[PDB]
Amino acid sequence: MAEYKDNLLGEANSFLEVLEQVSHLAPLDKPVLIIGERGTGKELIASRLHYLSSRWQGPFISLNCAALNENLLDSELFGHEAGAFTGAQKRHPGRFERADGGTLFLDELATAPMMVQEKLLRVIEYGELERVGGSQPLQVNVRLVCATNADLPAMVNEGTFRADLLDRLAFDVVQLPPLRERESDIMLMAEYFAIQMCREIKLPLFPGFTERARETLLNYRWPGNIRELKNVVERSVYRHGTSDYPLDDIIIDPFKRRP
Amino acid sequence: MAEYKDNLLGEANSFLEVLEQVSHLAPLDKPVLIIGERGTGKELIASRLHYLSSRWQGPFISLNCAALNENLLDSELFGHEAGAFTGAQKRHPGRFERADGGTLFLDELATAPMMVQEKLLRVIEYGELERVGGSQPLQVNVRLVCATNADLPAMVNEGTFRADLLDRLAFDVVQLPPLRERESDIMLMAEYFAIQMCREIKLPLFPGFTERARETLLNYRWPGNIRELKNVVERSVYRHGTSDYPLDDIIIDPFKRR
Amino acid sequence: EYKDNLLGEANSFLEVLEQVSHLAPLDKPVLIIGERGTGKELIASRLHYLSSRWQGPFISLNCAALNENLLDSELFGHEAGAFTGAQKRHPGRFERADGGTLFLDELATAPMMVQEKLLRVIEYGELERVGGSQPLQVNVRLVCATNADLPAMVNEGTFRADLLDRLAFDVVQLPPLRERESDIMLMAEYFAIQMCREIKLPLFPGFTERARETLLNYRWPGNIRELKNVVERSVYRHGTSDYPLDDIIIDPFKRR
């Protein structure tokens, strides 16, 4: 077993509390659920959760519920035997069976339609699945990890989500603090991305940061917590392109005209 | 050429005009459309056209355009010279070719799927149908006569029926008057149907028709066609009994609860 | 230099060429705001042909051509005949050109699912095949050409916000033709010379004043396509070099 730290920057305040909380979740074999705003680095913690587990050697596979071909949904979810339907030349492993002893990443559960909800409703509680066109059933043990973007209790009262599935995946929820609220690691994230970008453009060194840039950072609403901060840092440092001085202007939106 | 033995029982003085019209079409090889409604005996007219043509000695296959399979359409229409088994000494014949030398009758034209529509349109305009496999075109000579009951102009307007094959296959149409339009032959059909029923049930004798029964079946809007009238007579004659008294009761529809 | 076609005296063209020179080395996603007929697969060629590597295949040919189920197969192909309609393995389009760059035309038309799949593929490089097998990772640059406002059609929610921000790392808009003022005669001359060479004319006789007024009055919806057709058709209908051209074929489909 190793550390599997991967990329960890800007750890302070409630983010450190979240890391401390998730540190001990990996030994447990109960489903987990992560709530957070879009692009709040949710996958990073979800991935690290698998590596911190004792059975970290299990293969890691990810599916996104927003991208499910409705025609191939059942086959992809469960698995199809050979010759079950026409055109099935060989036996093909399903996604659930693909991971055994390894975690499965689920995404966009808030966008999960009732169809996928019903098809997946039972394979979780008992870990039991039978392939389409299958004669005998298979049993597997997989730790489910889920990420979402909306208020699942709200969708439950709205009626487009099943409380059965919700409580099937509601042991514990991790609330990622949005960076625009933490406001304590924006400098560190920005400077880290700045060093990475200035290094990969093969420039000698990165100059400092302009005080006006810091002034205008905190003012922005930042819908992109840590997915547009990196992008804006990269684009602005590219715009400057020199170690001449700390960049005074940040190009917050690329759509803005050059003049 | 030889007038086949069929029941047309025509006295309406409009059916006679339709008969003369179709008889004029008997020799010609041009495509023919039969326009009618439910029932109306269009199959008899189509058989009359095929069987009083010069090519009457030819075959008279009649395909149900609703009954052709989707995937198997090409092989069904054309055939494959290759046998079903290795070293086969023969092949299955397609719908086309099996018609060469005679007329091909088409029915339920409106409900024909778009695949059937587009596949059939190409073959008629040029012929030269080729079976799957090989590169040898075979030239065919087939007369087309079709009958339908829907409104193909409306089908064209919706676009669920291609207008091009219609235009190619609408050289001339024959109009069939409904039974309510005829309104004069009802006695003779009623009697003929009853006489046939007499043998079918093995009833000994026809009892006769009452004036009330005549009035009721005559005074009907008749949305149903000749076959509906046929079934009517069939129901009443059986419900009547053993002909010890003249037939008195006609049940128009066997659905009222009573 | 590929003859460096379509030379622009426009300061906007000069500055956009200057930027494309800078985006040439780095493997970052470039989004080109070029209306239809405006720089259509004209600067993406320069971007692939000025990058660090030019050996990577440049197939491009991505459009709104296919519906969602057909565009899916176009992008990623099939998993070794795993399912109906597949007799063999079709690597698709991402695997088709590896180590180079691809191009997208009318990506705004693309369905929500393939938008999101582009999101999942661009970051890591892994390509989950349609069959469901293990994902294979490839390194390819992406250039995207649209014609409409993405902020609006993400305001309606039709674009994934993550995809818009991630793919639109750096935008490069283009000058439309009607803003181009003094280069219209330059384009007319250049196209006329190329046309007279391709029809093996001895030389070009020149323009006239009525024709110049016509090339001043029109609107020209297409930046290149609209006028190249007009000028080549006019010179072809002229079919001579003794007399300077005076007839202009505005629309090829006018009656009589």
Binding site: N71, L72, S75, F85, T86, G87 | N71, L72, S75, H80, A82, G83, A84, F85, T86, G87, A88, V132, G133 | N69, L70, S73, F83, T84, G85
Partner: peptide
């Protein structure tokens, strides 16, 4: 673009047990 049970012939074949014996008769040395 679907999963559906379909059918279309382009091939032919046939065989009997004694024909199988006759075709395996030529697999072996003299």
């Amino acid at each position: 673009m679907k999963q559906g049970l379909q059918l279309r012939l382009s091939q032919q074949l046939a065989m009997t047990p004694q024909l199988q014996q006759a075709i395996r008769l030529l697999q072996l040395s003299t």
